[PDB]
Structures are given as C-alpha cells and as structure tokens.
A paper describes a structure:
Three-dimensional classification of the particles revealed three distinct conformations of Gea2 homodimers that differed only in the positioning of the GEF domain, with each monomer adopting either a “closed” or “open” position relative to the regulatory domains. Based on the relative numbers of particle images that sorted into each of these three classes (~30% “closed/closed,” ~30% “open/open,” and ~40% “closed/open”), the conformation adopted by each monomer within the dimer appears to be largely independent of that of its binding partner. Strikingly, a closed conformation of the GEF domain was not observed in the Gea2-Arf1 complex cryoEM data; instead the position of the Arf1-bound GEF domain was similar to that of the open conformation observed in the absence of Arf1. In the closed conformation the entire GEF-HDS1 linker is ordered, whereas nearly 20 residues (residue numbers 781–798) at the C-terminal end of the GEF-HDS1 linker are disordered in the open and Arf1-bound structures. For example, for a portion of the GEF-HDS1 linker in the open conformation, the cryoEM map density of some side chains is not well resolved. In contrast, the closed conformation, in which the GEF domain active site is oriented orthogonal to the membrane surface, appears much more suitable for productive encounters with the Arf1-GDP substrate via diffusion than does the open conformation. The structural data therefore suggest that the Arf1 nucleotide exchange reaction involves conformational change of its GEF from the closed state to the “open” state.
Author numbering:
A (entry chain A): 329 to 440, 455 to 545, 554 to 758, 768 to 782, 799 to 871, 889 to 892, 903 to 986, 1007 to 1135
B (entry chain B): 11 to 26, 71 to 154, 162 to 230
Write the structure that this text describes.
C-alpha cells in the first residue's frame, strides 16, 4: 500500500507544471492514460484512504488545469479531458470545490483556435449524456449553498450561446449539433417525470435567500450609499448603527470587490465610520508590516493623496489604542521585542507613509530608478519628533519587503481556495428554478435554429421539443413563456386572385412551404390539450381569431362548427363566402400544392381544436371575437362581408350558450349584435337570419327590455 | 460503471458506413443502469467490423484494438452479460482474418495472449483455437517482419501451448 502512494507520486512527477521540459509529450499523454486506468479500476473505494486522497485531489488537479488553458496541441488535451471527465463521473460526490474552478475556466476559454473548441465541446459532452439528471444533480449539490459560483445556470447559458448557427466564425461546423443534443435532452428529460403527477397536486428557501443576497450584492456594488439602507430593508442586519454594518463586511469579504469598500470609505462624511471599522481588528503581538499586509488584503488603496490621507490617519490612530504604554525601557540592545516602542499618534502617522512607498517604485516596473537601502534610512533622520528610530527597525521591515510583494494572477487565486477547505414531487419542487432563469434563452435558440435551418429531420425534432417546452410552461403558471411560444408560432405559420377545392395566394403560399405545415399542426395540437384559459393573453386571442378568419377568407374552413344550434333553430347552413369563378387560370404546379393545404387543415381538427374542448370557452374569446368583426363594406372585401358577419354572430351564439355567466356578458354581445345589424344595405338573407339570433339573445339575457322594444318597433 | 464504451466511441469517431454504426451505438448506449439486457454481440460489433475488413488505414485499426483491449482489461464483458460467450467467440474470430506498421500486429498478438490466457478463453470453440494458432505460427515463421515482433510471437505461442496442454488433464 505504500507502493501505491509512491507510484502515484511518481505519476504526479510525470505530469506537472514544474516538470515540463524534462519529459516529452508522449510521456505526458501516456501518464494521463495511466491515471485514467488507475481511477477506473477502483475509484469508489479510493476516497477512503486520506493519504492517497490528498494526492489524487490537491496537486494532480494542478497538472490537469494548468495544461487546459496553456496547451495548444490536441493529443495531450484529449487525454487530459478524458481523465477530467472520468474524475467527474467517478468522484462526483466529494471533490466539489476544485471542479467548479475548472468548469469556470472551461467556459471562459469557450465563450471568448477552431479545432480546440470542437475538441473541448466533444469531450465535455458526455456529462449530460451519461447522466441525464446532471443539470439537476449539480443544482442540488452545488447551487443550493449560499457561497460559490452559480455555474449550473451558466452551463445552459453557455450551451445556448454556442448553439446558434451564428457560431460559424467562433467554432467549426461540428459544434452546434453536439451542444444541441444536450440542449434538447434537457427538455426531453422532463416528460419522463411528468406522466406520474397531475396538475392540481402541485398547486428551496435557501435559493430564495441566495437570490435576495445576490441582488443585494449587485446593488451594493452599484451604489453602497443606497445599498446600506437597502441592506437594512432586507433584515440581514441588527440596526442602522455602524457596529453591525461594520461586522457584516469582514466575514463576507470574499464576494465583495475591494474597490467598492475603498470608494465607500474614502468620502469625508463616512470618516466617522473609520472610528469603529478598525476597532474590530487587533494586531497586538504582531509587527506593523504584517498588520499592514492584512490591511491591504481587505481593500484597495486609492489614488488621490488627500483621500489617502484620512485613511492612513484612521489606520495609524487605530493601532495606538490597541496597545497600552510601557515605554520606559528604551534601548538598542533589544532582540525582537515590540512593546518598548509606544509612539504618539503623529509618530505612527509618519511611520505609515514611508512603509507604503517601497511597493510602487522599487517593485513597480514603470519606474526604472531605484532608491537604495541607504536613502530609505537616510530619509527619517530627525523626522520622528527630534529623535531618530533605531537602525534595526528598518532593516527587518526591508527584509520582510524583499521576500514577497503584495498583490491586488492564476497561482495566487488558489491560495484563498484551500483555506476554505483546510480551516418525485420533491424533484419537481426543486425544479421550477431551472426554467425561470434560462427559458427565454432556450426558446429563442430553438426558434432561431428552427427558422434558419431547412432540413426536415432537424426541424421535426425541434418542433417536438418545442411542444415539450410548451407543456412544461403549461404545467407551471409562468404566463410569459407560453404566450411567447404560441404568439411566435402564430407569426410563423404564414397566415397573418381568381379562385375556384380553392386556390389562393395564402393557400399557394401554405402549400409551397413545408415550414407552415408543422407549425399549423403542432399549434392547434397545443390548443387541443389545455387545463386553464387564463394563461392566454389578448394578443394570442387576436392571433388565433385572425387565423380562423383568414382561413374563412378562402374556402378552407367549413363553417358548420355547431350543427346542433342550427338544427335547434331550423336554419340552413350559413352562406358560403362566394369566391370568383367556378368550373371543373391555374395549371400544373399551382393546384397540386394548394390541395395539400386543404388536407393539412383537416388533419388539425380546426373545428374542434379551439371550440371543441371546453377549456378555452371564456369571456375573453367572445369579447375579442366580436371586436374582430369588420362592420364595413369595401370593394377589396366585398367577397365575404355578408357572410363573415353571420359566421361571427352564430359562432358567438354557440360559444355564449356554453358559458354559465348568464347575467353580465350577454349585454355586451347583444349590444354589438344590434350595433352590427344596421350596416349599409346588407342583403335580404342576412337581415332575415339575424332576427332569429336576436330573439335568441333576448331569451338568454335577463331584464333587457329596451332592446326588445326597439326590436319590435 | 459501463460508460467507458461510449467514451471510446467518441474517441474513435474522430476519423476525419462504419461511422453511422458507431453513432447508432452511441445513441443506443445513452441508456443508464449498466449494459443490462442488450444482446451483447451488438454492444461491440462495429469494433470488429473495423478490424475485420481490409480497406482502412492502420491508425483506425490501432485505435479500435486499443478500445477492445481497454474493454477487456476493465472487464466490461463478464458472466452477467447476456450472450457474453458469443461476443468473446466473435472477437477472437475476427482477429484471425485480414487486418492492417508492425505495432498493430503486436497489439493483436497481445490481445490474443490476454484473451486466451484468461478464464473466458476457455469458452472458445475448439474449431477457433486452431485458427489462432495458425495465425500466430504464420507470424512467427515469417521473417519479413521485425525481429522483436517475431520474439513476441515466439513467447505468446509458448504461453498458449502451455495453456492448451494444461487443459489435457
């Protein structure tokens, strides 16, 4: 078992950043394959041994990550991505913080050569494929915690940005199908978990708190002056007094930018806050340079000298109160004892300035001249109030400066990382946060691929997944996605001369285009199955009404939707819309397309689509369908003015007979019927037929007597 | 797990009638929860189609043979797998016919060693081991190849002779 540790240390020595030039790349790809095989043979039980677990966790992920961003060849990158994916699949339970950084850097390189991006996508693809619940599982395991990134949503956002045909310049032609496979697999996963559960039964508080926190962080970074009382508004703080607000800043400094705190503390009105900000920290038993280092880790230095003056004043004044006074044993023979020095406020104030100068000139590259060790000790001759500092004071600080510089790129970011570590119905409920933050993007990309592409096979899969998305939006009560889907499909159907089995401009445009066929079928396939009318909005009602009216414009839709009403009231069928010329010009390819359209509408069950099922029968449909009436003769629409009015009227009578609100809604439709009945000299049969409907409305309504009087008179 | 086969499928797909078979194989093995009832001749048949034919360059054949060796070494096919006997029959059967510079033949020889020496090699039909012995003897007797491959041939034939005559007990 020690042999295993020695062998894995040797494999670490094979592949690493430091041991780059010694061994060739054939050795490195071979070592990657070896580590892959070692993980594969036993990875479930590899976690138990901590001496080995540190070796496979901490220092080998360095070798993994360092040669994704920096490498340029393809062969090594293949094996490294193989090892990475196997590590994700096998050891996904633990090893959670380190993996997030490499996914973040993966998407960073992906979003911003050609073949390398294809290899990246093609290799990382298997995570969603072999684990269809990967997007959910990463959300449970990683997203729900308050801290860390939010790369679960960014995964789908990155796939969405990569999915379009617009990425020809960014990536080669193989990427879009590969990412679109997982993009469609996401929606296809949900129908597996829908069959069991009904709508009414359904009808992550930590995530709610995280959303509140992230919005507060965004506002606080945008404007701390308003953000502070806004932070009090959310109840995350004890009170307005500066003690609690100052306590908030130190604990959660990892997420906040340094510049925000720097500009917040710079203003003169908030200088009193510095009386209590530094009071929390206490550097007793530590030298001034270490305390200055911890201070510089917490915020960024300003640029203006006058602004810097008050900050240095507060910093220097804060140290004095921490330490008491025992200075009577001044001497130069001391060997690392601090308490003998107990300077005044001015002494620490002057001591602060000379310490910071070494970083921005000697270590800075722009300035070439160097002020030596001589002139630094030469500066303060008789500057600390008539008595000089001891000459062993500055040498220790200069030695402490010379070892390491302060940092306000890649290696240093790991330093904060390890310090964090070292020191069925329920799934649906935990769902509904995924779709809210990605749904518009997913439907936009699906529609973009559907409208740009031309192959039938891709488009059928697209429209089916589109219907899956529509069902998903229907199960919850989003009512912003669903209207977008149905409205854009309504635009996409392509229904917004001498005819004869008619032939028409809209008909021939329908038949010649395959795109409209699937849209018209699947659209009323959505309308067939529904469980509430309120999700529809006014615009979609206008769209479907315009669809049915445009179909009535030609002899496509047979207006015999309700034979029961006509058989009750004993009228013939409504008069057909009277086309031009009839015999059995067009020839060859004109008719053969259009007849197919005459087939396809019959496949939609258009009569029983929106009117058949009772779910869509509501006040909105009647109220807008009466608005749809033209009420105006024109030479352009003289073909069908006499018939559209009768069709609309009878269709509304049948619709109103179903609704049980038999008190209010009848008044509006009776009003519009009598307003419609007085058109300019409409023909005899129309006025003949309209009075039967008018008597029926008078029967339906209650206490509508004036209209009956006018009807008689 | 049994996710290794899909990974090798995407690895071999980068070759730029067989690519269609491999993509069908990937779409089929999207399925989870082990290989299960899969009729295990078909889980790896397109790999045998690569090595069996004689119209593909050596690089793809080497990749396919590496995939086969990976499957056997990790023991993807086991006693629990349906029709494992037929699959391990077919994999030795295909290698005897035409193939393919010399490293490909050594890979075939090493895989033959590993298959025959293991327990599953006992399940091969007695009409097949003669073909394997004929192939290895043709490699060993011929001198046009490199000498080190001939020595590898010598060692494998000694090993499989010991394994065969041990069964005579």
């Amino acid at each position: 078992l020690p042999v295993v540790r020695q062998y894995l240390n040797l494999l670490l020595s094979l592949i690493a950043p430091e041991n780059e030039l010694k061994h060739s790349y054939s050795t490195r790809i071979f070592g990657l394959e070896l580590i892959q095989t070692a993980l594969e043979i036993s990875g479930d039980r590899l976690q138990l041994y901590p001496r080995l677990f540190t070796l496979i966790s901490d220092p080998i992920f360095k070798s993994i990550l360092f040669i994704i961003q920096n490498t340029t060849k393809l062969s090594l990158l293949q094996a490294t991505l193989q090892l990475f994916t196997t590590l994700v699949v096998i050891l996904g339970n633990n090893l959670q913080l380190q993996i997030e950084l490499t996914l973040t850097r993966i998407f960073s390189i992906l979003l911003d050569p050609s073949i390398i991006k294809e290899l990246l996508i093609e290799q990382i693809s298997i995570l969603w494929t072999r684990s269809p619940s990967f997007f959910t599982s990463t959300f449970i395991n990683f997203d729900c915690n308050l801290d860390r990134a939010d790369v679960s949503i960014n995964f789908l956002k990155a796939l969405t940005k990569l999915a379009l045909p617009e990425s020809a310049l960014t990536t080669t032609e193989s990427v879009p199908p590969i990412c679109l496979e997982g993009l469609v697999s996401l929606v296809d996963d949900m129908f597996d978990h829908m069959k069991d559960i009904d709508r009414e039964e359904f009808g992550l508080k930590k995530r709610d708190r995280k959303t509140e926190f992230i919005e507060c962080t965004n506002a606080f970074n945008e404007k701390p002056k308003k953000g502070i009382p806004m932070l009090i508004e959310k109840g995350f703080i004890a009170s307005d007094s500066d003690k609690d607000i100052a306590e908030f800043l130190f604990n959660n400094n990892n997420r906040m930018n340094k510049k925000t705190i720097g500009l917040l503390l710079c203003h003169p009105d908030k200088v009193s806050l510095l009386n209590e900000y530094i009071r929390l920290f206490d550097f007793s038993g530590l030298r001034v340079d270490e305390a200055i280092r911890i201070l510089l880790t917490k915020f960024r230095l300003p640029g203006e000298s006058q602004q810097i003056e008050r900050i240095i004043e507060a910093f220097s004044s804060a140290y004095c109160e921490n330490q008491d006074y025992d200075p009577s044993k001044i001497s130069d023979n001391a060997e690392d004892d601090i308490s003998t020095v107990q300077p005044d406020a001015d002494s620490v104030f002057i001591l602060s300035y000379s310490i910071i100068m070494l970083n921005t000139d000697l270590h800075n590259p722009q300035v070439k001249e160097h002020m030596s060790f001589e002139d630094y000790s030469g500066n303060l001759k008789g500057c600390c109030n008539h008595k000089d500092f001891p000459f062993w004071y500055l040498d220790r600080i200069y030695c402490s400066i010379r070892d390491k510089e302060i940092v306000m790129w890649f290696e240093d970011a790991w330093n904060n990382l390890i310090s964090s570590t070292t020191v069925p119905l329920e799934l649906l409920n935990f769902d509904r946060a995924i779709f809210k933050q990605v749904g518009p993007s997913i439907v936009s990309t699906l529609f973009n691929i559907y409208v740009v592409a031309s192959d039938d096979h891709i488009s059928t899969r697209m429209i089916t997944s589109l219907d899956k998305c529509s069902y998903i939006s229907a199960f919850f009560d989003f009512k912003d996605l669903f209207n977008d889907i149905l409205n854009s499909i309504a635009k996409g159907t392509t229904l917004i001369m001498p005819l004869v089995i008619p032939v028409s401009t809209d008909a021939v445009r329908f038949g010649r285009s395959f795109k409209g066929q699937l849209n018209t079928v699947v659209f009323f396939r959505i309308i067939r199955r529904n469980k509430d009318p309120k999700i529809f909005s006014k615009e979609l009602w206008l769209n479907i009404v315009n669809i049915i009216l445009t179909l009535y414009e030609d002899l496509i839709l047979s207006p015999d939707i309700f034979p029961d009403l006509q058989k009750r009231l004993k009228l013939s069928n409504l008069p057909k819309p009277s086309p031009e010329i009839s015999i059995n010009e067009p020839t060859e390819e004109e008719i053969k397309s259009s007849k197919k359209a005459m087939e396809c509408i019959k496949s939609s069950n258009i009569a029983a689509s929106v009117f058949g099922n009772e779910s869509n029968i509501t006040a909105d449909l009647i109220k807008t369908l009466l608005d749809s009436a033209k009420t105006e003769k024109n030479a352009d629409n003289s073909r069908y003015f006499e018939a559209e009015l009768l069709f609309i009227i009878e269709l509304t009578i049948a619709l109103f007979l179903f609704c049980k609100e038999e008190k209010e809604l009848g008044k509006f439709i009776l009003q519009k019927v009598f307003q419609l009945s007085h058109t300019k000299g409409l023909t005899k049969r129309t006025v003949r037929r309209m009075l039967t409907y008018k008597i029926l409305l008078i029967s339906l309504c209650a206490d509508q007597t004036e209209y009956l009087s006018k009807l008689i008179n | 797990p049994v996710t290794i086969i899909i990974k090798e499928c995407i690895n071999l797909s980068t070759a730029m009638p067989f690519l269609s078979g491999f993509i069908q194989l990937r779409l089929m093995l999207n399925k989870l929860k082990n290989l299960d009832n899969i009729d295990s001749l078909t889980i790896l048949q397109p790999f045998l189609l690569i090595v069996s034919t004689s119209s593909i360059s050596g690089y793809i054949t080497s990749l396919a043979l590496d995939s086969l060796q990976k499957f056997f070494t990790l023991n993807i096919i086991n006693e629990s797998s349906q029709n494992y006997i037929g699959a391990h029959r077919a994999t030795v059967n295909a290698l005897t016919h035409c193939r393919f510079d010399d490293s490909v033949l050594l890979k075939v020889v090493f895989l033959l060693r590993s298959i025959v020496d293991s327990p599953y090699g006992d399940l091969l039909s007695n009409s097949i081991i003669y073909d394997v012995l004929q192939t290895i003897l043709s490699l060993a007797c011929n001198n046009r190849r490199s000498e080190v491959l001939r020595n590898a041939a010598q060692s494998t034939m000694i090993a499989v002779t010991v394994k065969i005559f041990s069964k005579l007990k």
